[PDB]
Structure 1
Amino acid sequence: GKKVLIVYAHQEPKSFNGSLKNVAVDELSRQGCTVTVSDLYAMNLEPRATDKDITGTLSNPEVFNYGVETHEAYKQRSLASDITDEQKKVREADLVIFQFPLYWFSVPAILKGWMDRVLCQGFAFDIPGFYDSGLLQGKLALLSVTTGGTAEMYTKTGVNGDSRYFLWPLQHGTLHFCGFKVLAPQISFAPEIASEEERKGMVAAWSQRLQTIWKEEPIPCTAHWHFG
């Protein structure tokens, strides 16, 4: 069998993002996959990296060190329940799909917070123990991104540069760092200015792609892919 986690970051269920998430649930479920959705806004996910992320502290340390404390907390199974619930979903997933609108050439802050807090030292990677040696090796990940800008704007000659450029910290610095193999991104450009028919086509294209997702080869998640 195959298990899929969709990490979804949009406020509005009727949005284009919400439609992309729903068609992924519907297609993957039809195939007989196990599917789970983390709807970050609906969960009111905490994005801040704070001492609340470590449970069971009787007396605060004089000096708070988020990196040291969360690494230790992971090993002691004393992370906050929201984090460990997400970690269980990741641990079990064969494929993690991130569904989000592009915000400032990156993920919305609530999703950045999921990355910062969930993908902790000892769980997702170790030092050393990263990139191909990351702890989530054997899993796949995919970014499904929507944009304001058109595909042409996101070319090397366009004002926003190649779309691949902004993908580097996400695909490579985050997903590959943790040991994921990365499937090619699904970028749905400029739905807001698209016709109704074009919008429906972008949704259908995603659904169609998912029919054969388990047959895809990952990208070579290298500097050449992103910048060459």
Structure 2
Amino acid sequence: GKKVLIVYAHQEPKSFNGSLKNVAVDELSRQGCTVTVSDLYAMNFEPRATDKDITGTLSNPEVFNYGVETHEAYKQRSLASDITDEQKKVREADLVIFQFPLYWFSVPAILKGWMDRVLCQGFAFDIPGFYDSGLLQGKLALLSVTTGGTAEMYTKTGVNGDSRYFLWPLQHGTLHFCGFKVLAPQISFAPEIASEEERKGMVAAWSQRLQTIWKEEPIPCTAHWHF
């Protein structure tokens, strides 16, 4: 069987993102998959990287270095429990789906904080395991993104440039760097202005796509693919 984690970052259960997350839960559950959702806003997930992320006393209360203190805290099982809970769900997952509206060509800050705080050194990567050989090798990852801007605006010679340009920090700089094989993003362009039927069509396409998700080939996560 397979374990799926959906990390979901939208304020509103009735939203289009809400529906995409619920269709993913229904379909993967139907297939017999083990499903877990991290609903960041409902958890009121803490996005800031602070000394509060380390329980007990710090490895150097003089000069606070977040990257080093969390690395040492991981190794010695001394991270705050919101972080260690997320890492447990990630560790056990076979597929991690991120479900979010595009904010400023990127993830909402709440989801940026999950990545900043949960994918720490020792857990997600280390000197030996950057990129291919990142500590999360074996796992699949998939961005399901909704946009304000239409698909035409997101072309090579449109104002916004190509969709693949903004994916680079997330797919390559984050997911690939951690060891993830990355599946082709799912992008539901401009739902707010699509018809009720185009909306239905995008939701169903997602459901339909999750049906064969495990047969999918990972993208080549490379400068060429993105650019």
TM range, normalised to the smaller chain? over 0.9
Q: Secondary structure at the match of 1:110?
A: helix
Q: CA-to-partner distance for each residue in 1:59-94, whole Å, 9 max, x for gaps?
A: 971111101100000000000000000000000000
| Per-residue deviation, 1:55 | 0.3
Q: Evaluate the alpha carbon distance shift between residue 62 and residue 142 of structure 1 in structure 2; reply closer, same or farther with a 3 A threshold.
A: same
Q: Could you tell me how far apart the structure 1 residues matched to 2:135 and 2:68 are?
A: 18
Counting matched residue pairs gives: 227
Q: Distance in 1 between matches of 2:76 and 2:177?
A: 23
Structure 1 residue 129 displacement after superposition: 1.4
Distance 1:66 1:125 in 2: 15
**SS of the counterpart of 2:13?**
coil
Residues 59 and 69, structure 2, Cα contact 8 Å, conserved in 1: no
CA offsets 1:93-143 (integer angstroms, 9 cap, x no match)? 000000000000000000000000000000000013110010000000000
Inter-partner Cα distance in structure 1 for 2:209 and 2:80: 36
Q: Determine helix, strand or coil for the equivalent of 2:7.
A: strand
Q: TM-score, normalised by structure 1?
A: 0.98
- Taking only the aligned residue pairs, the percentage that are identical comes to 100
Runs of 4+ that moved beyond 6 A: none
Where do 5+ consecutive residues of structure 1 fail to align? none
Between 1:176-185 and 1:58-67, the stretch displaced more is: 58-67
Deviates more, 1:178-187 or 1:122-131: 122-131
Q: Deviations over 1:175-196 (max 9, x none)?
A: 0000000000000000000000
* Gap change, CA 1:132 and 1:64, over 3 Å in 2: same
Distance 2:155 2:128 in 1: 35
Tell me, in whole angstroms, the C-alpha distance in 2 between the residues paired with 1:50 and 1:127. 23
Q: Distance in 1 between matches of 2:163 and 2:59?
A: 47
Deviates more, 1:191-200 or 1:54-63: 54-63
Q: RMSD of the TM alignment (CA)?
A: 1.0
**Contact map agreement 2:150 2:189 (CA 8 A) in 1:** yes
User: 163-172 or 121-130: which moved more?
Assistant: 121-130
**Higher mean C-alpha deviation, range 107-116 or range 61-70:** 61-70
Aligned equivalents of 1:181 and 1:58: distance in 2?
35
Q: Which residue of 2 aligns with 1:142?
A: 142
Aligned pair in 2 of structure 1 residues 14, 175: CA closer, same or farther (>3 Å)?
same
CA-CA distance at 1:58 after TM superposition = 7.2
